[PDB]
Amino acid sequence: HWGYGKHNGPEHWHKDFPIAKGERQSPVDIDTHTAKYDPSLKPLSVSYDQATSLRILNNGHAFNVEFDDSQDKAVLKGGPLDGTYRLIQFHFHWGSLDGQGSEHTVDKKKYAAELHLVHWNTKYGDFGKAVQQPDGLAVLGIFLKVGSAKPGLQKVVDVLDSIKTKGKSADFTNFDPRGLLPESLDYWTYPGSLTTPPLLECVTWIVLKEPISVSSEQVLKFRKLNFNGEGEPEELMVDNWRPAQPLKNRQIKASF
Ligand SMILES: NNC(=O)c1[nH]c2ccc(S(N)(=O)=O)cc2c1-c1ccccc1
Ligand SMILES: [Hg+2]
Ligand SMILES: [Zn+2]
Numbered sequence: 001h002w003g004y005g006k007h008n009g010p011e012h013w014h015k016d017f018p019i020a021k022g023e024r025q026s027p028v029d030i031d032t033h034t035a036k037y038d039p040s041l042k043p044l045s046v047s048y049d050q051a052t053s054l055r056i057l058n059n060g061h062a063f064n065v066e067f068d069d070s071q072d073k074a075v076l077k078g079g080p081l082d083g084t085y086r087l088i089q090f091h092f093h094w095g096s097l098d099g100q101g102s103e104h105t106v107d108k109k110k111y112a113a114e115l116h117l118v119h120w121n122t123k124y125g126d127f128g129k130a131v132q133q134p135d136g137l138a139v140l141g142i143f144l145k146v147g148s149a150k151p152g153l154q155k156v157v158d159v160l161d162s163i164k165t166k167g168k169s170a171d172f173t174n175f176d177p178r179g180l181l182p183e184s185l186d187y188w189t190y191p192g193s194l195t196t197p198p199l200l201e202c203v204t205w206i207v208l209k210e211p212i213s214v215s216s217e218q219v220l221k222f223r224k225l226n227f228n229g230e231g232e233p234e235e236l237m238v239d240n241w242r243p244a245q246p247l248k249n250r251q252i253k254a255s256f
Helices: 152-161 217-221
Strands: 044-049 053-058 062-065 076-077 083-094 115-119 137-146 170-172 187-192 203-208 212-214
Touching: 053 152, 062 152, 076 115, 083 137, 083 170, 083 217, 152 170, 152 217
Parallel strands: 137 203, 137 212
Antiparallel strands: 044 076, 053 062, 053 170, 062 083, 076 083, 083 115, 115 137, 187 203
């Protein structure tokens, strides 16, 4: 099935998922001199104080930290969004080297990794229904650069040993996603898609200008993960990022 390798990677995806060549695919390059400040944007509201993490899973592509979304506990609202979007999970995309790994790029600049906090529009009842709607999802994207360690990330880093291979999961309760945010909530926003198959065009992307810094040892542990299942030949989980897709005269707006 689909992956990130030469034989199942991003330019093979269109065969099983024709929408890969669609009109609002993600990620995209953010050309900072083409993005326009939008005064009609409300401030962004990230309410993660009552977030309830459930567990962490290696899905053979990346790892997901999953949250209980059966109540309004961790919500995204404001900015370009109408109504309330509930946090369901977060995950990352990263490279084999610090000079690559992010999915969105900024004036062609690739970051070492990208964090995606995935939220679904609560007017649709559940995630499965939300992904059938053009405004079903909101993904908050945060760039990672290598520098000082991010203390709020370390609990995630520590558990990765326990979920090395495809299909492995571990209890991951009481994780506070507030520890992953940069200071500034300045952002760019554009309408887009899932960056993974089925590549559904259901996403309002909100990409934060300010990156977080993570340590070299933190990222190195990400790179120790496996794409393969236990007992299979080792295929390191690295370069699990889709490259930038045609903007196709969508408009990227800036909050600042
Ligand atoms: N990880 N399992 C999933 O079902 C999944 N759901 C997603 C929703 C949104 C996005 S996104 N990257 O465009 O923010 C990704 C996912 C995923 C997923 C994420 C990483 C690897 C494989 C699947
Ligand atoms: Hg959709
Ligand atoms: Zn993602």
